[PDB]
Nucleic acid binder design. Sequence first.
RNA 1: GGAAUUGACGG
Length: 533
Amino acid sequence: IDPETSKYFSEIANLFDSNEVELEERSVICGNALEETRGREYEIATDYIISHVLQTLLEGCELDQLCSFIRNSASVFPAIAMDRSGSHVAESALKSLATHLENPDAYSVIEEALHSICKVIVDNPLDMMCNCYGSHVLRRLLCLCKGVSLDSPELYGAKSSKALAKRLNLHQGFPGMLTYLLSGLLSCSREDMKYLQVDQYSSLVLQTALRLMLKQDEQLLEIIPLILRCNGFHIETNVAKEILESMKDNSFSHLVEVILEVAPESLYNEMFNKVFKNSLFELSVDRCANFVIQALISHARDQEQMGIMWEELAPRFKDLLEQGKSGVVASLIAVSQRLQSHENKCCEALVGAVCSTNESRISILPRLLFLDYYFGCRDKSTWEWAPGAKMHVMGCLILQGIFKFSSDHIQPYITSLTSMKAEYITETAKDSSGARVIEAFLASDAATKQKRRLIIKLRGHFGELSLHTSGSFTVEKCFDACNLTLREAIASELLDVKVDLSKTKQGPYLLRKLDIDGYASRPDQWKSRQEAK
RNA sequence: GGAAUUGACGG
């Protein structure tokens, strides 16, 4: 790259920093600057400095000039896409195309641009899929072909609180282009495919494509056998063995997670019987495979599978908790309630797992609230609490699922929570995971007198709870579950902290929802409007 | 206006 080229693209850069150029002129200058890339797309897109300017250009130009860049650069796009700087240039071009998805006049121009990209990729895909930079480009490209434009963690595919809450049960796009690109990424030998399964970056690409094909059963039934190398759907014994042995690999385990999530019923049933049945517990103790088990459990379809999973895993609930595999337990509990099978057996197995003697069953709640401290401590027969400590996220999610059961199945849990001394209860409410347990109990079908007993034990702390951003929710839910007598006590306690409360983010909504000002000025009128509630 | 598993990701 000669100095006139660098000086030119730098000077274009400085010209945009000096915001003396309206958007109208700006998008013209962007398109004109793209012409200075013709014949040297690779050199400029991979330049560690000028790549950043070229990103600015692709995101600020108009659809016609963007499409010309994608067409002119297409024979070198795979090289650009696999470069540490060029990959962000390639991704800028896709993000820019994606801004036009909502425009129906743009459909055929975009499709043509994707076609020239997909054609060069499909011609030689395997190194691009496995390249650390190129894998990100493919992920975005697959998303664009599907018509999604907004990056989502799950699609790329990170963990997210929304997916956990789903796992724990708490635009048309360019379809022919998606199918054509994906078929190109899959038309390799069974022996190549065996190693795509275990390469981090290719696994990530296939995870995205699988997720994008959710509920496209005719396609999923074509692509999943290719990924699993078992080309009616049937897994032969030798292939099932190879799948089972690769299940502890970190890359393949993530891929099988997604496969279980999108698998149509007949495909799921075959994987259940031919791969996982009889190995559930061994896979549940592996640091990678247990998450595959977590996904298997979540998408179980019928009570017969629920029986098989309960036999292999419930006797080992204590082992799973000790070895840091509470997610497996959480999933089994959660799906029993979804399938309406083995509900009582699951709750009773969890109690027995945490409380071996009969004496210790009154402590089921504190021990699940601090799952890791209790199973970690030197002497478990004296562990009572973990003062000051952050409570255990998955133990609290377990409890949140527990309280969605009918009260018939969870009497040990209700008794244990409603028995905790006042200081422990308010400690739970001040904890951002523990408050979700309390709110789950308040929403459960446990008796009102039992709810009222726990709420009464929070008296004297509603002011401080209201100051917590998480605890303030608990205050409303306590309030809504109360008689007039306790609605007034709570309202009175938010009164003493009204100045501080109104500062905080939630305060204004809390004060309004509870009508705290009306209580302070017209207490009789406040009381009579609540007794009507 | 709220915590988000124990195992991956970029000039």
